[PDB]
Structure formats: structure tokens, C-alpha cells
Design a protein around this ligand. Structure first.
Ligand SMILES: C[C@@H]1O[C@H](NC(=O)c2ccc(-c3cccc(CN)c3)o2)[C@@H](O)[C@H](O)[C@@H]1O
Ligand SMILES: [Ca+2]
Ligand SMILES: [Ca+2]
Ligand SMILES: [Ca+2]
Ligand SMILES: [Ca+2]
Ligand SMILES: [Ca+2]
Ligand SMILES: [Ca+2]
Ligand SMILES: [Ca+2]
Ligand SMILES: [Ca+2]
Lengths: 114, 114, 114, 114
């Protein structure tokens, strides 16, 4: 199944933050409106916050996360969770190798802000 | 129900990161084995990261998040999500006021690392 | 925090299913737009499906689960999870006593149907 | 990523329930320690419960859900959610066709029981 694609409420600010846990340098692309809106990158085996940004979900609300390691696309896993019918998290894990920890880049999207 | 309490595997490193979305200055305390192991504070209305740290679950694996504003405990909401049977997120939201957005401090715990 | 309340898309069909795990008879009421739309009662300590029904979220999309034992409301825990940006679960646990297993009645809402 | 595989605590009872939402008969296999422990078959486009059973996770704790239609493996999506650090749900969706609703057979695993 497609992973890493989330429908947010339209025209709504959201936070996006990326963590790294791999020997490989991670590159995280965040697409809004099917166009790159943010790119994060780094290399850590200790959960470094390689990037964090506030974005707007735009007219469609479609947000997509993609991860690559030296130009090679990582496999993704994702889900969305809603607490008290108000607080949203869209979660992505990615795997760049064979150990299937899916933590090589971890991405968290949260909304609402403010 | 109690919220913000998680059982991790023993002696396991985990990431904890906090974001603020409030006029109130947030204090986030992360307890491991019922003792404060990390404290973060900050104030933002725009999802600023107010702390990130890697901790060890220790012998107990008992992790608890507490949030306060002006000496008063915030009301918490929380859940744990597991993706592809491997990637764990422990998620916390907190409410310091009356609008029930539950994003006043947002805490994300993730493991495994590395 | 309020628990057991979910906003579904308006005019959407959804399933609701209740399980019991208690010495006490569970009464599960499912409200749509604040009016009772389905009720299930039963006693099980072996996860019997005390009822399942299909409903429509109607104009409001507001769906609420209540659980009581002999007229006393149980404490509720809940969350909503979305898989592959399409498949939704709204999850409820309830505690009618002191052991905090939160399984005394378990209620699962799923959509879309068909 | 692998989907539909869950690690439960060893030697623990769990509930498994399957719903159908497809014009084709669904066949759901539940494997414990890589061996068939339950099979459910049924057809509904209205969320009928096609099977429900209580199983034991046994010595391995390894539970896997597979779904096939008319012989052919359906694509799966899954996750596990824990509420109040006590109540577990393992959730599976499956897609047998072209619409990507992932509700063709829906499987819900819950523990603990009793
Ligand atoms: C009602 C819809 O049912 C769809 N499933 C099928 O159409 C399906 C399942 C197996 C077969 C089937 C078998 C044998 C030969 C053929 C070819 N005619 C086809 O068709 C679901 O995917 C969809 O979401 C909807 O619920
Ligand atoms: Ca890896
Ligand atoms: Ca890794
Ligand atoms: Ca607030
Ligand atoms: Ca706020
Ligand atoms: Ca109980
Ligand atoms: Ca019970
Ligand atoms: Ca389908
Ligand atoms: Ca279907």
C-alpha cells in the first residue's frame, strides 16, 4: 500500500520534524501540492533532529513524505493517529538497508498548531 | 485513565522531543523509574522544539511524561503506536487551558534508535 | 480529556462492534448526533461480540460511544488510527472496576464500508 | 514493509475478529508460530463479521494475518495501538481489487482478555 501520504485539513499549518538513525546520510523531502516544500538531511545513529519546519497544507491538504539515501529511495511505513478527537500525528518510518528497523529516518507531522 | 505512562523494554535508548503551542511557558519532565531524567522548557505558539534528548529506559523500562505550566499539571492525552512490528512511537498531548486543543506541549518518544 | 467521541465524515457508513471482558454486564450505547443509534448489552469474560451494527454518521458526523455497568458509566480510553490514508479505526476501551485492564467493554468503529 | 505480523506477549489469550466489505468471499488465515490457528471465510459488502475466535499466542507470541480471495493474496496494511499502556489492538486491512479502500477484509486483534 502507498505509505507516507496524508490528507490534512486544507490551508492549515502543520509541523514536520525528521530524526536520523542510520550510518547513511538521510534526505527527507516533504511535498505539499505535489511540490517539494521542505528538505532535511543529516547523519546520526542517535536520533538527531535533522530538521524541523512549519508548513501550510495548501489547497488540497495533501502532504507526502519521501526519503532517500544516496539517491536510492527508502521503503516507507506510516500511519496517522488522532488523540481526543483533536490532536493529530502523521508518522513515517523508513528503511535504507536490510535490518528492517524502519528508523533510518523517522518523520513526525503534527497539527493543529498554535 | 492514566496518560503519559509507557513501558519500554529495559536498558533501551529512546528519543524524547517536545514542541510548544501555547502562550504559557511549558515545563516537560521525563521520568525514568519515577525519577526526573530530563527537563525541557520553552514557550512558542509556532511548534518550536523546546527540547530533545536521548535517554536510557534503565532497569525498570518505566517512562512517564509530565507537563506543567505555572506550577499546575496539564491534562494529558497519550497513546503508543507500533509500525511494521518494529518502530515504536509514544505520543503525548497536553492541555494547559480551556480551548482543548491539547497541543500546548506535544511530546514524541521514539524507539529503537541507532 | 473527553474520550469516546469521534468526528467522522458526514453521511458515511460505519461499523461499530463491542466486545466484553468483565464479570459485569456491559451496556454499550452508540450515539449519532447525540441520539442513541445502537445499543448492545451482555456479559462475557472471553471477548464475546456483544453486538455489531452498521450505521450512518449522518449530517453531523458526530459519533459517541458510552459504556455503563448497571447504570454507572465506565471510564473510557480512546484514539483514532488511519492506515494508508484511507482505512479508519476509532478505538474505545473502558474500565468498570479497579484493575485498570480497560478491556471490560472494548468498542471498535471502522470505516469506510462497502 | 511486512504487514500483518504482530508480536504478542507469550502464552496470552487474544481475540481475533474479521469483517468483510467486498463482493468476493474473503479467506482470512491467522497463523500462530507460523502455523494456522484459525481460518475465517465469508462474503459481505456491509461489514459482516465473518469470524471471531479466542486464540492463544503460545510460546512464540508471533501472530500473522493473511488474506486471500479466490486463491490470491490480498495486499495488507497494519498497525498496533496501545491505549493507557494496557489495552492493545492489532489492526489489519486488506485490498483485493482496484479501489484502494483496504477494507475488503478487516481484521482486529485485541488483548488482554478477561
Ligand atoms: C464491492 C467491491 O468489491 C471489490 N472486490 C471485487 O470486485 C472482487 C473480489 C474478488 C473478485 C473477483 C473474483 C473472481 C473474478 C473476478 C472478475 N470478475 C473478480 O472481485 C472490492 O475491492 C471493492 O472495494 C468493493 O468492496
Ligand atoms: Ca535500517
Ligand atoms: Ca537504523
Ligand atoms: Ca490549549
Ligand atoms: Ca495551544
Ligand atoms: Ca477491569
Ligand atoms: Ca476485564
Ligand atoms: Ca477494495
Ligand atoms: Ca471494499
Amino acid at each position: 500500500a502507498t505509505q507516507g501520504v496524508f490528507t490534512l485539513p486544507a490551508n492549515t499549518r502543520f509541523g514536520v520534524t525528521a530524526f536520523a538513525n542510520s550510518s547513511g546520510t538521510q534526505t527527507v523531502n516533504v511535498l505539499v501540492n505535489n511540490e517539494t516544500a521542505a528538505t532535511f538531511s543529516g547523519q546520526s545513529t542517535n536520533n538527531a533532529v535533522i530538521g524541523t519546519q512549519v508548513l501550510n497544507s495548501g489547497s488540497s491538504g495533501k502532504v507526502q513524505v519521501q526519503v532517500s539515501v544516496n539517491g536510492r529511495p527508502s521503503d516507507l511505513v506510516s500511519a496517522q493517529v488522532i488523540l481526543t478527537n483533536e490532536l493529530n500525528f502523521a508518522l513515517v518510518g523508513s528503511e535504507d538497508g536490510t535490518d528492517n528497523d524502519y528508523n533510518d529516518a523517522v518523520v513526525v507531522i503534527n497539527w493543529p498548531l498554535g
